[PDB]
Each structure stands twice: as C-alpha cells, then as structure tokens.
Amino acid sequence: IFGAIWPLALGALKNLIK
C-alpha cells in the first residue's frame, strides 16, 4: 500500500498547519 502512504504524507502537513 505504498501508493496509499504517500497521499497520506501530504495530509499530515495540512493537518499541522490547518
């Protein structure tokens, strides 16, 4: 599920800033 972990890595940032 590597292709599913990258898309989540970008959300981890938007969650910290918003």
Side-chain angles (χ1 to χ4, degrees):
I1 58 144
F2 181 55
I5 300 300
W6 236 120
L8 187 82
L10 270 172
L13 178 72
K14 228 131 295 261
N15 283 126
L16 182 81
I17 60 114
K18 201 267 199 138

Coordinates of all heavy atoms in Angstrom, one line a residue:
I1 N 0.9 -1.2 0.0 CA 0.0 0.0 0.0 C 0.9 1.3 0.0 O 0.5 2.3 0.5 CB -0.8 -0.1 1.3 CG1 0.1 -0.2 2.5 CG2 -1.7 -1.3 1.2 CD1 -0.5 0.6 3.7
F2 N 2.1 1.2 -0.5 CA 3.0 2.4 -0.6 C 2.3 3.5 -1.3 O 2.4 4.7 -0.8 CB 4.2 1.9 -1.4 CG 5.2 3.0 -1.4 CD1 5.7 3.6 -0.2 CD2 5.7 3.5 -2.7 CE1 6.6 4.7 -0.3 CE2 6.6 4.5 -2.7 CZ 7.1 5.1 -1.5
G3 N 1.6 3.3 -2.3 CA 0.9 4.4 -3.1 C -0.2 5.0 -2.2 O -0.6 6.1 -2.4
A4 N -0.6 4.3 -1.1 CA -1.6 4.9 -0.2 C -0.9 5.6 1.0 O -1.6 6.4 1.7 CB -2.3 3.7 0.3
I5 N 0.4 5.4 1.2 CA 1.1 6.1 2.3 C 1.5 7.5 1.8 O 1.6 8.4 2.6 CB 2.3 5.2 2.6 CG1 1.8 3.9 3.1 CG2 3.1 5.9 3.8 CD1 0.9 4.0 4.3
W6 N 1.9 7.6 0.6 CA 2.3 9.0 0.1 C 1.2 10.0 0.1 O 1.3 11.1 0.7 CB 2.8 8.7 -1.4 CG 4.2 9.2 -1.5 CD1 5.2 8.4 -1.9 CD2 4.7 10.5 -1.3 NE1 6.4 9.2 -2.0 CE2 6.1 10.5 -1.6 CE3 4.2 11.7 -1.0 CZ2 6.9 11.6 -1.5 CZ3 5.0 12.9 -0.8 CH2 6.4 12.8 -1.1
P7 N 0.0 9.6 -0.4 CA -1.1 10.5 -0.4 C -1.4 11.0 1.0 O -2.0 12.0 1.3 CB -2.3 9.7 -1.0 CG -1.6 8.6 -1.7 CD -0.2 8.4 -1.1
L8 N -1.1 10.1 2.0 CA -1.4 10.5 3.4 C -0.3 11.4 3.9 O -0.5 12.2 4.8 CB -1.4 9.1 4.1 CG -1.9 9.4 5.6 CD1 -3.4 9.4 5.7 CD2 -1.4 8.2 6.5
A9 N 0.9 11.2 3.4 CA 2.0 12.1 3.9 C 1.7 13.6 3.6 O 2.1 14.4 4.4 CB 3.2 11.6 3.1
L10 N 1.0 13.9 2.6 CA 0.7 15.3 2.2 C -0.4 15.8 3.2 O -0.5 17.0 3.5 CB 0.2 15.2 0.8 CG 1.4 15.4 -0.1 CD1 1.0 15.2 -1.6 CD2 2.0 16.9 0.0
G11 N -1.2 14.9 3.6 CA -2.3 15.3 4.5 C -1.8 15.6 5.9 O -2.2 16.4 6.7
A12 N -0.8 14.9 6.3 CA -0.1 15.0 7.7 C 0.3 16.5 7.8 O 0.4 17.0 8.9 CB 1.0 14.1 7.7
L13 N 0.7 17.1 6.7 CA 1.2 18.5 6.8 C 0.0 19.5 6.9 O 0.0 20.3 7.8 CB 2.0 18.7 5.5 CG 2.5 20.2 5.4 CD1 3.6 20.4 6.4 CD2 2.9 20.5 4.0
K14 N -0.9 19.3 6.0 CA -2.1 20.2 6.1 C -2.8 20.1 7.5 O -3.4 21.1 7.9 CB -3.1 19.7 5.0 CG -3.6 20.9 4.1 CD -3.4 20.6 2.7 CE -1.9 20.4 2.3 NZ -1.5 21.7 1.7
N15 N -2.7 19.0 8.1 CA -3.3 18.9 9.5 C -2.5 19.7 10.5 O -3.1 20.3 11.4 CB -3.2 17.4 9.8 CG -4.3 16.6 9.0 OD1 -4.0 15.7 8.3 ND2 -5.5 17.0 9.1
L16 N -1.2 19.8 10.4 CA -0.4 20.5 11.4 C -0.6 22.0 11.1 O -0.7 22.8 12.1 CB 1.0 20.1 11.1 CG 2.0 20.9 12.0 CD1 2.0 20.1 13.4 CD2 3.4 20.9 11.5
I17 N -0.7 22.4 9.9 CA -1.0 23.9 9.6 C -2.4 24.2 9.6 O -2.8 25.4 9.8 CB -0.4 24.1 8.2 CG1 -1.1 23.2 7.2 CG2 1.1 23.7 8.2 CD1 -1.8 24.1 6.2
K18 N -3.3 23.2 9.4 CA -4.8 23.5 9.4 C -5.5 22.2 9.5 O -6.0 21.7 8.5 CB -5.0 24.2 8.1 CG -6.3 25.0 8.2 CD -7.5 24.1 7.7 CE -8.7 25.0 7.4 NZ -9.2 24.5 6.1

